[PDB]
């Protein structure tokens, strides 16, 4: 077809435009004409992508009103092709201008006096500078932008203890861009003032001269302010002598990857507390005088909203001084703290954040700004965030690694660059939940709304209303926290909307008549993050989202996903937080090649299946009766099952001579790494048995068993798993009065979680937990006492007990005493803590 050719020539043009945009994002464009040129090219790039998507999907529909739809597609592709040629003909000079792009050393200025709340931090780093090996050791101070790294570094740099200890103290302002030669000349200028003799000396010979100067000066400290790369550290460190005189390097940086590679345990800077934020703000606004009582109430609120960041407090203090000393004006600043940081003061907050943001790779920028779609101060599930980047299309990677492994590397890269903060880390070390600081969150909102137009918030404000069709013709994605039912009531027309992110934290039971609003208003809906919205029924419009990649919804009345779901071939992630105990997926989802997750909450009875689902990774809950041989043939690269239902059929063996059950199929997966089991049988009194380990999965890493009533005798078979690291038992997962362990087992086990155990006694051996780190005993009221062999674990870190009996508390005290004695014998503690209340009983 000639239409196929038209899309081909269009695609080559966008190949140049996308390459132009990627190289245009490598640095900030300050010229206003270039800014609009980038916005125009980005707009036509996006709109062309929205039209090729219409062509490729409609072609897929045509393979299985078609004339009219094809005519409309060809008419559209004709229009964008004309618009592309319009840019290439009229804006031809402009495209060259950005292509043909190519100073003063702005060393930061910090508080020399009135440094609030850094006394403890300064002493911690100073005492760390004193100790260590005689060789060169680095003490990197790492944190988010504007945290006070240079302020603490200068506090240490001028500290009387440091000035006495270190004869030579050098401050070097490293940065994103620097001259390796000028740094060595700067250090040399500290000692000898004759600069004319080094006019032609090579750089490496200058580094040799720096070596002689620092070496003769005895023990020395060097403040490498704002080192951005490890390559810069290697280039500069060649001039630092290793004389064996305990000389140190204090390396403030925003990068944790650089910090860790210079010292294994980087020093992370702290945030100011709520009391310290008000003390600093009051000091900045008022010159050595107390706050008036009328201004104390709004001033405290402002300091709280700065989230303990000294940069935000200093910026907001400049606004407060200009706004007089009136309660009304200080109330206006409190209502718009974020606006005064980024928009009103671009030199202080906006420009400093741009240093880290513009340094990101082009793919990481779309991922970082996407974190600002969620409400300010909220905590984002890391698993949910990862699947959002991949489903949207920010993870463009063509290597052999799985996409979620690459995205997890991207998320860890953002955390390493301290653009994202981790709240919860799993015992295995992975990221569980993350949040963006309030200053960076306003940057993410402003950047992805006005400059990049990545997403748009929808709210009913005083000066803002629900956008009209003139605004919706521009919006790429929508995020909305509240008032969703009324926005869907007015029947919007989001033609170019690729995402609908209901980032609200409160469940909303939408009326059934507004259900088809979401799929009918946004035909190009790729990502539908409707996790908070409760849907009681489906509709044919809901299954017309042929461009859909991500779908999350919560149901109470929907007992079965209809087979119409199978028309959406582009979906990757399925999430259904259904409260029902049963759920049937009628759709033939096996033919969706890019299907990756099925995070059901009930026993999923998948339908019956030369083709391989190479991408499928996770099944949260599946029916045991659906564990056919064909199912596991299609999922070789899968990495997690979950089995909820009647486990009796899983373990029962027929009398026809076949002694292998459905568990044999589970163990044949050569890439499994997570298994979860939930048993529904409760009327029977049978305690269950566990199959032998030679039919278990070879590469299983994590387990989680709930309410299965396994006998305590058969988990010595579970100890034969060589690569087991995580094990969770919940809701009386095991039954029996006595627990005894055989020799060996758990060669790599790291965490064991137990809730509502049925046992009363437990006996163990020293070889059972060679590498155990964490043990959890929650609601274990039946526990009499713990075995004393648990104190032989050298790698143990934490044992936590909740609602334990009096005798169990005595055993916990005895184990704690033995662990304390062993640690006091010469083994440094790993940070043990124990929950006891009251402390006076049993002392």
């Amino acid at each position: 077809l000639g239409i196929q050719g038209e899309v081909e020539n269009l695609l080559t043009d966008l190949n140049y435009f996308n390459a132009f945009l990627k190289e245009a994002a490598k640095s900030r464009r300050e010229n206003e004409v270039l800014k609009e040129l980038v916005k125009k090219i980005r707009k036509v790039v996006n709109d062309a992508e929205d039209s090729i998507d219409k062509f490729v999907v409609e072609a897929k529909r045509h393979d299985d009103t078609h004339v009219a739809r094809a005519k409309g597609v060809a008419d559209e592709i004709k229009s964008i092709r004309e618009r592309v040629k319009e840019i290439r003909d009229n804006d031809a000079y402009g495209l060259q201008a950005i292509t043909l792009d190519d100073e003063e050393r702005k060393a930061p200025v910090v508080e020399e006096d009135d440094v609030v709340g850094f006394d403890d931090e300064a002493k911690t780093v100073i005492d760390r500078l004193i100790g260590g090996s005689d060789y060169v050791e680095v003490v990197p101070v790492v944190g988010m932008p504007g945290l006070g790294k240079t302020t603490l570094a200068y506090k240490i740099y001028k500290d009387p203890k440091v000035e006495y200890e270190f004869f030579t103290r050098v401050w070097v302002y490293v940065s994103q861009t620097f001259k390796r030669r000028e740094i060595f000349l700067n250090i040399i200028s500290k000692f000898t003032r004759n600069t004319k003799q080094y006019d032609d000396t090579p750089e490496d010979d200058l580094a040799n001269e720096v070596k002689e100067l620092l070496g003769k000066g005895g023990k020395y400290l060097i403040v490498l302010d704002d080192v951005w790369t490890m390559e810069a550290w290697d280039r500069i460190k060649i001039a630092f002598p290793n004389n064996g005189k305990r000389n140190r390097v204090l390396m403030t940086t925003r990068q944790s990857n650089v910090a860790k590679r210079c010292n294994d345990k980087p020093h992370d800077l702290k945030f100011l507390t709520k009391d310290e934020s008000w003390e600093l703000l009051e000091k900045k606004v008022f010159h050595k005088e107390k706050c008036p009582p009328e201004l104390e109430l709004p001033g405290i609120s402002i300091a709280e909203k700065c989230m303990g960041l000294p940069l935000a407090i200093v910026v907001i203090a400049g606004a407060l001084i200009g706004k007089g000393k009136t309660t009304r004006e200080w109330e206006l600043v409190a209502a718009s703290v974020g606006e005064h940081l980024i928009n009103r003061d671009p030199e202080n907050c906006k420009k400093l954040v741009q240093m880290s943001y513009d340094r990101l790779p082009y793919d990481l920028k779309a991922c970082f700004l996407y974190c600002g779609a969620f409400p300010g101060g909220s905590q984002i599930p890391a698993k949910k965030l990862i699947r959002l980047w991949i489903a949207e299309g920010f993870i463009q990677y063509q290597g052999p690694l799985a996409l979620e492994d690459v995205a997890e590397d991207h998320l860890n890269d953002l955390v390493n660059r301290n653009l994202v903060m981790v709240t919860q880390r799993s015992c295995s070390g992975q990221i569980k939940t993350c949040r963006v600081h309030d200053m960076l969150h306003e940057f993410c909102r402003h950047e992805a709304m006005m400059e990049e137009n990545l997403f748009q918030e929808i709210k009913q404000g005083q000066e803002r209303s629900f956008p009209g069709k003139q605004e919706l013709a521009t919006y790429r994605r929508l995020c909305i926290q509240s008032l969703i039912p009324e926005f869907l009531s007015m029947k919007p027309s989001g033609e170019h909307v690729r995402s609908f992110l209901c980032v609200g934290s409160k469940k909303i039971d939408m009326p059934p008549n507004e259900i088809p609003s979401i799929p009918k208003a946004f035909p190009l809906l790729r990502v539908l993050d409707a996790e908070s919205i409760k849907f009681s029924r489906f509709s044919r419009e809901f299954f017309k989202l042929f461009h859909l990649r991500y779908i999350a919804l919560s149901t109470d009345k929907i007992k079965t996903i209809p087979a119409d779901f199978g028309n959406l071939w582009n979906i990757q992630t399925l999430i259904v937080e259904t409260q029902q105990a049963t759920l049937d997926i009628k759709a033939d989802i096996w033919n969706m090649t890019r299907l990756r997750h099925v995070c059901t909450n009930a026993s999923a009875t998948l339908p019956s299946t030369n083709l391989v689902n190479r991408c499928l990774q996770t099944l949260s809950t599946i029916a045991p009766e659906c564990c056919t041989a064909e199912v596991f043939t299609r999922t070789p690269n899968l990495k997690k099952l979950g089995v909820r239902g009647k486990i009796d059929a899983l373990l029962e063996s027929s009398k026809d001579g076949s002694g292998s059950g459905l568990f044999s199929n589970i163990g044949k997966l050569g890439c499994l790494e997570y298994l979860k089991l939930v048993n529904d049988t409760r009327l029977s009194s049978k305690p269950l048995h566990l199959p032998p380990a030679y039919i278990f999965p070879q590469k299983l890493k994590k387990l989680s068993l709930v309410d299965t009533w396994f006998e305590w005798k058969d988990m010595s078979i579970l100890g034969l798993l060589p690569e087991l690291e995580v094990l969770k038992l919940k809701e009386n997962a095991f039954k029996g009065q006595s627990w005894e362990q055989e020799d060996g087992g758990f060669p790599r086990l790291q965490v064991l979680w137990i809730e509502r155990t049925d046992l009363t006694s437990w006996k163990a051996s020293s070889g059972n937990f060679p590498r155990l780190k964490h043990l959890a005993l929650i609601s274990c009221d039946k526990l009499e006492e713990l075995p004393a062999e648990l104190a032989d674990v050298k790698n143990l870190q934490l044992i936590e007990l909740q609602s334990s009996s009096e005798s169990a508390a005595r055993s916990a005290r005895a184990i704690l005493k033995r662990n304390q004695e062993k640690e006091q014998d010469g083994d440094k503690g790993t940070g043990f803590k124990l929950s006891i209340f009251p402390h006076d009983l049993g002392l």
Binding site: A19, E23, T99, D101, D102, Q398, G399, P400
Partner: protein
């Protein structure tokens, strides 16, 4: 060997495809030899340096051209065709 699989109706897309196939261990040896065969085509017909300059995607770089290894291979290309030129007319990177 067949001219159909050598002309390929383009050179820049082929060059990018060869680099993309290079990250796969099972395609590293095939992509490496095919990369050399692309240079064979560059020498056989003596295309203008403008085409090879765009094929290497050196068109987006400021002061960073020299440190880029693609610039070094771009210099090695003009040296190679200056040892295989059909006529003594010089070929230069400067234009």
């Amino acid at each position: 060997v067949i001219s159909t699989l050598t002309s390929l109706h383009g050179d820049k897309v082929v060059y990018d495809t060869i680099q993309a196939a290079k990250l796969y261990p099972q395609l590293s040896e095939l992509a490496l030899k095919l990369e050399k065969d692309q240079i064979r085509f560059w020498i056989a017909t003596r295309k203008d340096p403008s085409v090879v300059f765009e094929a290497l995607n050196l068109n987006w770089a400021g002061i960073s051209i020299f440190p880029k290894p693609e610039f070094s291979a771009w210099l090695k290309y003009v040296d190679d065709v200056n040892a295989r030129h059909p006529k003594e007319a010089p070929l230069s990177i400067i234009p």
